[PDB]
Amino acid sequence: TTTLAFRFQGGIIVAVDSRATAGNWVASQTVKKVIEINPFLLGTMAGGAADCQFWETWLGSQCRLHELREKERISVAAASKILSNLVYQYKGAGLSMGTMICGYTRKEGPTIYYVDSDGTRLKGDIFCVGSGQTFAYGVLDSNYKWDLSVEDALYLGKRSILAAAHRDAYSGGSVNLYHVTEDGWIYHGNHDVGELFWKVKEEEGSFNNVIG
Amino acid sequence: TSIMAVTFKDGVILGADSRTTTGAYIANRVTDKLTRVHDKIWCCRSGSAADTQAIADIVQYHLELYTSQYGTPSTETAASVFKELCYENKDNLTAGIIVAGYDDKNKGEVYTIPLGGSVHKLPYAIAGSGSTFIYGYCDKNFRENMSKEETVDFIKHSLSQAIKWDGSSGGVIRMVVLTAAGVERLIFYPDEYEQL
Amino acid sequence: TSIMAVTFKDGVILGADSRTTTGAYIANRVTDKLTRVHDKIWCCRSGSAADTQAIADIVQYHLELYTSQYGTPSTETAASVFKELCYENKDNLTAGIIVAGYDDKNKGEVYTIPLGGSVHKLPYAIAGSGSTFIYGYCDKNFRENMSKEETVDFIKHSLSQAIKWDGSSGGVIRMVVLTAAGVERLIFYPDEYEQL
Amino acid sequence: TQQPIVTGTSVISMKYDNGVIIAADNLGSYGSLLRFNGVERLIPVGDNTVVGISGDISDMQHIERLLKDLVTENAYDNPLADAEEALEPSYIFEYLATVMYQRRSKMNPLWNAIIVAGVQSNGDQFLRYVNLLGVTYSSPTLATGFGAHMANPLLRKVVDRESDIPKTTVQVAEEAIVNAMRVLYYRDARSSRNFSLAIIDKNTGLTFKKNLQVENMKWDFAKDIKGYGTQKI
Amino acid sequence: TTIVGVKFNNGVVIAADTRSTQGPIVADKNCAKLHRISPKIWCAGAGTAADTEAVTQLIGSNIELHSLYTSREPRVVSALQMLKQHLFKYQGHIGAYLIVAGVDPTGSHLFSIHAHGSTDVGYYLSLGSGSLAAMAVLESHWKQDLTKEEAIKLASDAIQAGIWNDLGSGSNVDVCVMEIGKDAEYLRNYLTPNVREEKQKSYKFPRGTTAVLKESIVNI
Amino acid sequence: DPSSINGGIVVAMTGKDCVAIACDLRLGSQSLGVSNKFEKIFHYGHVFLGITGLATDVTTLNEMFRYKTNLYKLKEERAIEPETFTQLVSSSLYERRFGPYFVGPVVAGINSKSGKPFIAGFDLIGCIDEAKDFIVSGTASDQLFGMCESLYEPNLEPEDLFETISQALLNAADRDALSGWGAVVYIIKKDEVVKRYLKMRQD
Amino acid sequence: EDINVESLTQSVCDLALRFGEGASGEERLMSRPFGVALLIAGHDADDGYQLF
Amino acid sequence: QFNPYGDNGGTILGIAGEDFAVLAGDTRNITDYSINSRYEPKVFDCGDNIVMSANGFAADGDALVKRFKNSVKWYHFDHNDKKLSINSAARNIQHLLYGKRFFPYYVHTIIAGLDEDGKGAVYSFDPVGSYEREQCRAGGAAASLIMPFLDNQVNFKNQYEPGTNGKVKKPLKYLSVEEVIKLVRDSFTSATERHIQVGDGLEILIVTKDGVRKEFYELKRD
Amino acid sequence: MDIILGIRVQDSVILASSKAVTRGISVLKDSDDKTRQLSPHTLMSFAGEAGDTVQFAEYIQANIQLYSIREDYELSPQAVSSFVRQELAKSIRSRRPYQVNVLIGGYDKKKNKPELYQIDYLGTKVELPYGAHGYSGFYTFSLLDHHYRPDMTTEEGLDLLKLCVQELEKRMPMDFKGVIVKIVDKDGIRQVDDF
Amino acid sequence: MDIILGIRVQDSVILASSKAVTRGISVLKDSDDKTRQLSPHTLMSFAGEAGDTVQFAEYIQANIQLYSIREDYELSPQAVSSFVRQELAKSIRSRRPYQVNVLIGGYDKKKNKPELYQIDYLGTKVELPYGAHGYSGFYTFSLLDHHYRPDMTTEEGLDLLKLCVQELEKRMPMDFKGVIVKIVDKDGIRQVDDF
Numbered sequence A: 001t002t003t004l005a006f007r008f009q010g011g012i013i014v015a016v017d018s019r020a021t022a023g024n025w026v027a028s029q030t031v032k033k034v035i036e037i038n039p040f041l042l043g044t045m046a047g048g049a050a051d052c053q054f055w056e057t058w059l060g061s062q063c064r065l066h067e068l069r070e071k072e073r074i075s076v077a078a079a080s081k082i083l084s085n086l087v088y089q090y091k092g093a094g095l096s097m098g099t100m101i102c103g104y105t106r107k108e109g110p111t112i113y114y115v116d117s118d119g120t121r122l123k124g125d126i127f128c129v130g131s132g133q134t135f136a137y138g139v140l141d142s143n144y145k146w147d148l149s150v151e152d153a154l155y156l157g158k159r160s161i162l163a164a165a166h167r168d169a170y171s172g173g174s175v176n177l178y179h180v181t182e183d184g185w186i187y188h189g190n191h192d193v194g195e196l197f198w199k200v201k202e203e204e205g206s207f208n209n210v211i212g
Numbered sequence B, C: 001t002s003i004m005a006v007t008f009k010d011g012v013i014l015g016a017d018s019r020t021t022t023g024a025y026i027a028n029r030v031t032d033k034l035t036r037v038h039d040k041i042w043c044c045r046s047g048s049a050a051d052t053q054a055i056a057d058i059v060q061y062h063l064e065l066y067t068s069q070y071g072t073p074s075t076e077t078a079a080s081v082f083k084e085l086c087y088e089n090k091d092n093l094t095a096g097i098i099v100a101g102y103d104d105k106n107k108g109e110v111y112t113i114p115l116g117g118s119v120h121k122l123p124y125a126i127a128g129s130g131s132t133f134i135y136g137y138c139d140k141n142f143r144e145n146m147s148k149e150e151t152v153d154f155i156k157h158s159l160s161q162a163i164k165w166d167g168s169s170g171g172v173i174r175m176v177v178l179t180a181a182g183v184e185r186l187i188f189y190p191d192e193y194e195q196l
Numbered sequence D: 001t002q003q004p005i006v007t008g009t010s011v012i013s014m015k016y017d018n019g020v021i022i023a024a025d026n027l028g029s030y031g032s033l034l035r036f037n038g039v040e041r042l043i044p045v046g047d048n049t050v051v052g053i054s055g056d057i058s059d060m061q062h063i064e065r066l067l068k069d070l071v072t073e074n075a076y077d078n079p080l081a082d083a084e085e086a087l088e089p090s091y092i093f094e095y096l097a098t099v100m101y102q103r104r105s106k107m108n109p110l111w112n113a114i115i116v117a118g119v120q121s122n123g124d125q126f127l128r129y130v131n132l133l134g135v136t137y138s139s140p141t142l143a144t145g146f147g148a149h150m151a152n153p154l155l156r157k158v159v160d161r162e163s164d165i166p167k168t169t170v171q172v173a174e175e176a177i178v179n180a181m182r183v184l185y186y187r188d189a190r191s192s193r194n195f196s197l198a199i200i201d202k203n204t205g206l207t208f209k210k211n212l213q214v215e216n217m218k219w220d221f222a223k224d225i226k227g228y229g230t231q232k233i
Numbered sequence E: 001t002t003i004v005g006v007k008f009n010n011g012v013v014i015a016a017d018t019r020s021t022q023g024p025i026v027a028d029k030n031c032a033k034l035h036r037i038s039p040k041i042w043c044a045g046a047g048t049a050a051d052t053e054a055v056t057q058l059i060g061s062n063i064e065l066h067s068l069y070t071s072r073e074p075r076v077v078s079a080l081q082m083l084k085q086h087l088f089k090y091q092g093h094i095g096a097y098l099i100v101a102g103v104d105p106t107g108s109h110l111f112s113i114h115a116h117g118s119t120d121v122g123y124y125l126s127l128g129s130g131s132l133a134a135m136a137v138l139e140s141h142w143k144q145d146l147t148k149e150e151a152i153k154l155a156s157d158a159i160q161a162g163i164w165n166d167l168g169s170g171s172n173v174d175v176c177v178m179e180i181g182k183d184a185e186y187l188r189n190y191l192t193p194n195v196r197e198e199k200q201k202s203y204k205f206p207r208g209t210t211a212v213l214k215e216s217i218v219n220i
Numbered sequence F: 001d002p003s004s005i006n007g008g009i010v011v012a013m014t015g016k017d018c019v020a021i022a023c024d025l026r027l028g029s030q031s032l033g034v035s036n037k038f039e040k041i042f043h044y045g046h047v048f049l050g051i052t053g054l055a056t057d058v059t060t061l062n063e064m065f066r067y068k069t070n071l072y073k074l075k076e077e078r079a080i081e082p083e084t085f086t087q088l089v090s091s092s093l094y095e096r097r098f099g100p101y102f103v104g105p106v107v108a109g110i111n112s113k114s115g116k117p118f119i120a121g122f123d124l125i126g127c128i129d130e131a132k133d134f135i136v137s138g139t140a141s142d143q144l145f146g147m148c149e150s151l152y153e154p155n156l157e158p159e160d161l162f163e164t165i166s167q168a169l170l171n172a173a174d175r176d177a178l179s180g181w182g183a184v185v186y187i188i189k190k191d192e193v194v195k196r197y198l199k200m201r202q203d
Numbered sequence G: 001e002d003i004n005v006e007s008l009t010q011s012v013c014d015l016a017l018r019f020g021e022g023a024s025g026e027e028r029l030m031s032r033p034f035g036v037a038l039l040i041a042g043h044d045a046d047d048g049y050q051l052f
Numbered sequence H: 001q002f003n004p005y006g007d008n009g010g011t012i013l014g015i016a017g018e019d020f021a022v023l024a025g026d027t028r029n030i031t032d033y034s035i036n037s038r039y040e041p042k043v044f045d046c047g048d049n050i051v052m053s054a055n056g057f058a059a060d061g062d063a064l065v066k067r068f069k070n071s072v073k074w075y076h077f078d079h080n081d082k083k084l085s086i087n088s089a090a091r092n093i094q095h096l097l098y099g100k101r102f103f104p105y106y107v108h109t110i111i112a113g114l115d116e117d118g119k120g121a122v123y124s125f126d127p128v129g130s131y132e133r134e135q136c137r138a139g140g141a142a143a144s145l146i147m148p149f150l151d152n153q154v155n156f157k158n159q160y161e162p163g164t165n166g167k168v169k170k171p172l173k174y175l176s177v178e179e180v181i182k183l184v185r186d187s188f189t190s191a192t193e194r195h196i197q198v199g200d201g202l203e204i205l206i207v208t209k210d211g212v213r214k215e216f217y218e219l220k221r222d
Numbered sequence I, J: 001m002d003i004i005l006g007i008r009v010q011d012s013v014i015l016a017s018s019k020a021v022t023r024g025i026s027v028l029k030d031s032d033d034k035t036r037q038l039s040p041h042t043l044m045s046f047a048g049e050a051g052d053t054v055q056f057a058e059y060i061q062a063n064i065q066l067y068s069i070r071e072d073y074e075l076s077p078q079a080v081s082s083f084v085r086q087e088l089a090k091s092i093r094s095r096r097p098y099q100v101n102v103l104i105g106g107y108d109k110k111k112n113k114p115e116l117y118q119i120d121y122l123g124t125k126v127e128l129p130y131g132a133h134g135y136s137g138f139y140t141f142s143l144l145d146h147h148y149r150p151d152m153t154t155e156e157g158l159d160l161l162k163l164c165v166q167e168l169e170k171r172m173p174m175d176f177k178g179v180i181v182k183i184v185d186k187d188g189i190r191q192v193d194d195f
């Protein structure tokens, strides 16, 4: 798995792969690794499939309840802290989650929290998480820029998950793209690596390690 | 340890060696492994001495309570109580116990309760480290309905041989006789049983 | 396995069960554990079947070589050769072997060689998993200088009881008789020995 | 139970046209010591069920008592306990299966393999297996432990598929069972020659045969087997 | 694997199933487990397949040299001693388990042999994962003085027991018949009771279905 | 275990007067893909050998077999046949019985004299899979078995055999994290050998 | 899925019972009944617009 | 040391059609090298046009199916016999499984049925509750053999239109129930050939608007 | 751990190797050159077990120089890398294996081409446009998969390495104390002082 | 691993804490502030097990603020450090111990003195002129044993920390991504942006 979120001038890009594995068996290539908690808040899933799907879905419930109770959407900080507080209660039980909680409120602005099953919660401008995180980093970091156009950012995110899908045995499938702004998230599609890789190799003239 | 109990024509006889070891050290050379839990219901002990003493103690308590409330408990009932304690606490006991009793209807009875807490009614039973060596001997020499004297001899011969081969057995041979006439304690010394 | 060898008035008799197991599976129900290494020198095998076959084979070779060079080897000499192989390779054998022979001077002889390779000359010897159960029986029933028939009976009774109690023993009872008159093979079936 | 001490080996069983047969030897082993020889491991529940048990004998005795208790309880305020509202094999099974899976799941198994045999009220044969893991299955033949390996292949030659069942008589099934018992005695080091057999028949009811002995054995040829390779005498 | 051996009034019969397994997978559905040590001495193996085949070849080669050297027909007991001594020397680490059968100038013979070097002799034997199922048949139907045709039937029934009841075994029955006074009679696929049914369709692809990046001729 | 560190697969199939053999292109170190061009199929005269497993042994065995077959050709004055090479591979492997090469070799070829298609497989110590419809090997061997038993039928023309062995390899590979990243396919007849590089997923 | 409106209503009433025995046998949660009532309004796919 | 888990082999197979779904399993049940039964069904009609198989450790599988069927019973009690929709069944099965996250049912769950638009549905679960809706899925012993085959034949993966230089995919197409059964039968005969834990019998449950129907096919018994 | 990188461009091969030497909680040295020249147009960088790396590299160097003198001819990069591979394959199954991974940059004066070989301690060898040993490949491979072109000048290769090293200083957990960069081309081997 | 340093000078206590957060072969963050303010004149820095450090520090902070509000009075550094110590001593023998080491810098407004407390996860507490957690003490303690004077100004304390951090960047094996420095004195707590 490879997941990434980053803040830039035009808000937040979120990008994930869609591969799930058991040992060296490719179990699926169509897994949805982003959860849409509400129209302003996204979660990403890395680590244990069940651990992630279950707890982020539950986090969604806690967020809604907060909204019913306080008559306002929960903040990114507080939503990520619900998840962090929960996993920490289980610390040592063997949960396996590397997650990002991403979104917008007026108070905070575009906001990203890294949250894992160790209890680690971090605010930040850039995170890559998963078995393919280093491959995403190497590409994303090299070409990252605060003043990327929205288009260039969407592409850089896509290109970074693509780099990870290629090199990490355990990443692949397709790329799922999101942009988050002050008006919330917007979906930018599912991009099968099967056709994406070749298209990018041609357009870009990259991936020269490969026989074409 | 070498313990046995043998039904016969008039009741039942319990026998045991008197050796308790820790390592190769004989911590007690005159142990009394023949333990009373009711008037004419007794038991033979093998295994952990802490465990078998602790078990017999609690069984004696249960049968005392039984007696004041319900009347005389049967030999079977005593075996039931032992079994319940041995089976339920199987993961934390090392106890190999023979329960033996007299009553006017059945005369003598014998119930062996091996490690694990199962229970088996038998015309006779042998147990303890030393019994392995006398399986063949006891099988070939036991008859139903022996006299008291024939039965004493069988046990004397049996336990003498088990003591001969088993390092964990030795000392004196103890016997308890349960009949209508009451409870009789016997003892035999090495210089007697070692010549048989 | 239940193996024994018994000196008597006219020579020596070897006996064995016929069961070989791997796990609880009886891989061979008619094994022949009575193995010849010279005319009137034989052995009983217990332990690893690979080990005891391999040992007996090499001992047969040594005694064949002995015979062509030096003349008839003694029973003692055969026991010596076994011992040397069992002791020197103790860290890589599981062999419990009884060596038994006839000659005109000593008549019957028996040497047991337990795990580790020590050697013990004895008027009779029992061995194998099943022997534990017949220590007391054999001690009480063995006499020196029995007749052939009395000796066959002793072994039949002995091994029958060992087979009765030992899961690692069973099948038929095999016997080999070594005397001046030569070498005789006997067999007894479950329906005979199980009634004794 | 964390590990078995006193144990019973194979229970074996098969369906035939009008009922079921089940058998188990009378031995309680103690490691490699053949310790107890009159241990009944077939447990009739009412007139329609026989529960055969292998494994830890202490646990078997505990299950026996659970079964007697069922019989007792079922009769309370039950005017038809000997009739319409008697225990069905299927009720006895479901209960045991529930108990075995519960104990597995508390990490404290009843260390047994069990076959439940009987006839349901509509006349249907009942034959189903449960063990210390809570694993359950039915088949025209069932056998536990060692018997699964040698009795099953023998018994399946008789009832190989469901359609063989109505073609199979008690007489034929019983012969198959007994032969398998002889074979187990030949090759299972923890078997005994003495065994019990029960038939449950939709017409004749329960027939419980105690003290059978393995008979008609071949040992003859053993006289001719000498050495282990080259030895001729 | 299921292998058996059955003596009859005038020779010996050997038989095997034909399934070889990489774990729970079947690599070869029609494998050959009946090996020749010499023209009239044949063996069937279970255990580690490479060891079973290698040790077969080693002894076969040596038995042949021995036979040429001594100008004598190879004897089953010679294969026996050579094999067990070799296996013992290797202390079990050559995981060969074999039933060896044959006829020679001294008569007809049947032996089993295990990885540690121990050997048995009898009138009927079985080895491999399916040996308990096979042995149940042998123990039910063997009798002294079998004819050739009866020993073939019995051995073949025994392999079947393993084929049907042992997951370790399957597919076909192979037999070899070694009769005194005759050429060994090797019957490959004596029984073939497990043919795949016809598939529901052909999965032939239209030509050009598969994408190619580049193509070239190779020169041998 | 050593046989799954580098990843990769090989499959060979028989057809009518042809054989085919195929492999992926991956060389990785656990989850890290490293080489996009590591072929696993070699040839000595008209005999083809594919090898999966530990890459260093793949390379070593190749050199060992080029060495052995070259000497064979010199001494025998003719090139080695697939049947003979098969035995050679077996005994070379067995020679290392107790310290084996961690490999799963596969042989394919057409006997120059019978004109008969031949394939075989081996376990890591030389046991021969005499099977003659298809042979599979590598970290996706389960997948390959499944694909072959499904797609295969006997006496395919070379053009059809090409589609079959391609789809078997491609679909098996895409369900394996340690295989893929490209492929090559050889279609082998008496007078012609065609090598092709397949287009596949790059994840 | 969405909770059906009647279910929700039934759920609030079950809580209301908790000055005594629960609908599933629970022990009491409070020492007196509530002194308030509710009009519950909603929509679901099974019974459309409902008022309880 | 008590091991609470076992492996009973078996293989299962779910494929969704446009207006139907299919859930197939073999009927063989195993322990190590032995056959416990040649016919012990493991695909179950749970009501509401929902069929289910929990494959692996059969004791956990049975327990899980039992708990789920019970879950339906109570759903009906609580909601006046309201149909439990398949997506709702799936989310519920997620919770049953994750409830035992620290002592899991050692099984692979598949369920099949129709969605709220009457289209075939398959859902696949890992032992602790992770799930997705899929078009096809194999589970259990021979899944690693059968799944790539389904990828290729149900979803036309790696097939291109000829003459297009491998640039135009073979377009996705809904298969009929006839064509699906053919694929199911061939998958299993193939699994039976190469996997020792597969054989004896093939049971297929077919779900449509009109209900659940069953077909049975023999598989080789070795 | 040690960074060992290689990029093969149009006219040269470029090797970059970290300067740190670290034991326990002490950086012992920040100027360590992790290469030996095997011949005038062949350079080998190395990472791995303490002691093994220098012992192995010098053994190879000694042997290569010996061949140079005996034949009065410089073996090709292809020939040298194969000798190194074989030595490692013998090693891995010997009584004491060298735990050394290597990169070999060479300029083939006959083929007039740069070649770059990655060989690990098992004897796994592969020729690559770019290579790396250790954890560094987890960042550099994807980066170069994006940025590397086949037509590139030496200067571009250098820029490519500036990108890699910048990333490793950003994301690698250990302070590897910079790199020494060496260029292997038709004129031989030189170190880029201004890196 | 995490650098956590403290120097107590004449008129203030100064805390320095590394900015890196590292998991596996990834530096996740280079700007992480490893402190919570417990009260206006008391600061606590922290190192240790993932999750435990923030969970512990915030729990303490919440409790300290609660006391501030309940009593309308700010507990002394001595009182706060003792509460922290006790909480750790209870921790170490509880079912799940916090694996957290801490430094507490505080200005006692009553005694008009800076105080610095080093407390590890066992509940070991000591007051020191300078302190450190982790491997850093292996270099800083001897350095300050040489350079530290009791009479020093805040600025001198700062120079002292420049010396420590310079040494750790030289000799520590991991890239800890610099430090954030905070000064606790009579006017409260402030961060030195120009460090």
Ligand SMILES: CC(C)C[C@@H](C=O)NC(=O)[C@H](CC(C)C)NC(=O)[C@H](CC(C)C)NC(=O)OCc1ccccc1
Pocket (backbone or CB within 6 Å): A001, A019, A020, A021, A022, A023, A027, A028, A031, A033, A045, A046, A047, A048, A049, A050, A052, A096, A130, A131, H104, H106, H125, H126, H127, H128, H130
């Ligand atoms: C959101 C995830 C799908 C992200 C993805 C990678 O990060 N994770 C995964 O792919 C992980 C593997 C990874 C932890 C090494 N896989 C998983 O989490 C899979 C679920 C799929 C196979 C459907 N579950 C699993 O691996 O086995 C769980 C288990 C639990 C108890 C007993 C037996 C088996």
Ligand SMILES: [Mg+2]
Pocket (backbone or CB within 6 Å): B162, B163, B164, B165, B166, B167, B168, B169, B170
């Ligand atoms: Mg004594």
Ligand SMILES: [Mg+2]
Pocket (backbone or CB within 6 Å): C162, C163, C164, C165, C166, C167, C168, C169, C170
């Ligand atoms: Mg016996």
Ligand SMILES: [Mg+2]
Pocket (backbone or CB within 6 Å): F137, F138, F139, F140, F141, F142
């Ligand atoms: Mg494989």
Ligand SMILES: [Mg+2]
Pocket (backbone or CB within 6 Å): F173, F174, F175, F176, F177, F178, F179, F180, F181, F203
């Ligand atoms: Mg792949």
Ligand SMILES: [Mg+2]
Pocket (backbone or CB within 6 Å): A164, A165, A166, A167, A168, A169, A170, A171, A172, F202, F203
């Ligand atoms: Mg990938």
Ligand SMILES: [Mg+2]
Pocket (backbone or CB within 6 Å): G001, H084, H085, H086, H087, H088
């Ligand atoms: Mg619904």
Ligand SMILES: [Mg+2]
Pocket (backbone or CB within 6 Å): H191, H192, H193, H194, H195, H196, H197, H198, H199, H222
């Ligand atoms: Mg099969």
Ligand SMILES: [Mg+2]
Pocket (backbone or CB within 6 Å): E162, E163, E164, E165, E166, E167, E168, E169, E170, H221, H222
């Ligand atoms: Mg089979």
